[PDB]
Amino acid sequence: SQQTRVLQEKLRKLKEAMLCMVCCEEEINSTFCPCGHTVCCESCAAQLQSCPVCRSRVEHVQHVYLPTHTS
Amino acid sequence: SQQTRVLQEKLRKLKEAMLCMVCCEEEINSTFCPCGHTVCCESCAAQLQSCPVCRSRVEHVQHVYLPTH
Ligand SMILES: [Zn+2]
Ligand SMILES: [Zn+2]
Ligand SMILES: [Zn+2]
Ligand SMILES: [Zn+2]
């Protein structure tokens, strides 16, 4: 039904919000510290000097284990 | 259809996986450091001296800003 299409779209959008903002291919699993923005996979987060969201200096990257992880 | 019920269940399970594993009421927004388990809201994470997943000592809690919030 049309209701099925609406639910498919909500699911797709939620799952797309879980992917890296830089490569769009791998799941987000890394946090820039101390700002806390958690928007990148480990590879893309590794060479950034400043946060791509708020421009704060990245002192270090903290790996995150999220219950939503499926890759 | 039956597919509408199947999609409703998938959406419910994904939304539940984004909720605090302790209180089941608020969104996950906190990481236990240094282990990295990110399974609690800020109120439950403030009250735990040990990680509820791996039992490692919590040295500090890091707030996380997730695009899904
Ligand atoms: Zn990436
Ligand atoms: Zn930031
Ligand atoms: Zn909680
Ligand atoms: Zn842990």
Read off the tokens for B23: 């209180």
Asked if residues B49 and B33 have their Cβ atoms less than 8 Å apart, the reply is: no
Domain count, chain A: 1
Resolution (A): 1.5
Query: Torsions phi, psi of A24, nearest 5?
Result: 60, 15
Burial of A1 (0-12, 13-18, 19+ CB in 10 A): exposed
- Evaluate whether B28 touches A18 at the Cβ level (below 8 Å): no
Reply yes or no: is the peptide bond before residue B52 cis, omega within 30 of 0: no
Output helix, strand, coil percentages for chain A, rounded to the nearest 5.
25, 20, 50
Under a CB-based contact definition with an 8 Å cutoff, are residues B30 and B41 in contact?
Answer: yes
Q: What is the largest CA-CA distance in chain B?
A: 50
Contact residues, chain B to chain A, C-beta under 8 Å = 1, 3-4, 7-8, 10-11, 14-15, 17-18, 21, 28, 31, 33-39, 53, 62-68
Token digits of residue B65: 């800003």
Which amino acid does the sequence have at A35?
C
Give the determination technique: X-ray
Query: In this structure, what DSSP letter does residue A33 have?
Result: E
Report yes or no on B38 lying in a domain: yes
For tokens 């890394």, name the residue. A30
In a domain, A68, yes or no: no
Side chain identity at B40, as an amino acid letter?
Answer: C
Find the CATH number of the domain harbouring A25.
3.30.40.10
Interrupted after residues, chain A (C–N over 2.5 Å): none
Token pair, residue B6, equals 């199947």
Nearest Cα of chain A lies from the Cα of B41 at a distance, in angstroms, of 13
Angle between helices A2-16 and B2-17 (to 10 degrees): 20
Domain limits for position B33: 2-63
- Within-domain flag for B30: yes
Q: Which of B4, B21, B41, B61 to mutate to test the interface with A (most CBs of A within 10 A)?
A: B4
Q: Check whether the bond before B34 is cis (ω within 30° of 0).
A: yes
